[PDB]
Amino acid sequence: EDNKQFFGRHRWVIYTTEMNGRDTFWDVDGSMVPPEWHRWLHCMTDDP
């Protein structure tokens, strides 16, 4: 998180290099995040 960026880009995520059994070094999906961090990233709330 970086509050100095404009709203929309003030929270970002770097995805894991390996999830379950897929090698996600390059192919990263927008739904890999768990539901709680998904909510925090989409800014439905304020507390992580």
Ligand X SMILES: CCCCCCCCCCCCCCCCC[C@@H](O)O[C@H](CO[C@H](O)CCCCCCCCCCCCCCC)COP(=O)(O)OCC[N+](C)(C)C
Q: Which residues bind ligand X (CB under 6 A)?
A: 26-27
Least spacing, CB of residue 37 vs other proteins, in Å = 10
When binding is defined by CB under 8 A, the residue of 8, 18, 20, 26 that contacts other proteins is 8
Q: Which is nearer to ligand X, 7 or 26 (CB)?
A: 26
CB-based burial label for 28 (10 Å; 0-12, 13-18, 19+): middle
Q: Which of other proteins, ligand X, none sits in contact with 21, Cβ below 5 to 8 A by type?
A: none
Counted residue by residue, the chain has a size of: 48
Q: How many CA atoms lie within 13 A of 10 on its CB side?
A: 10
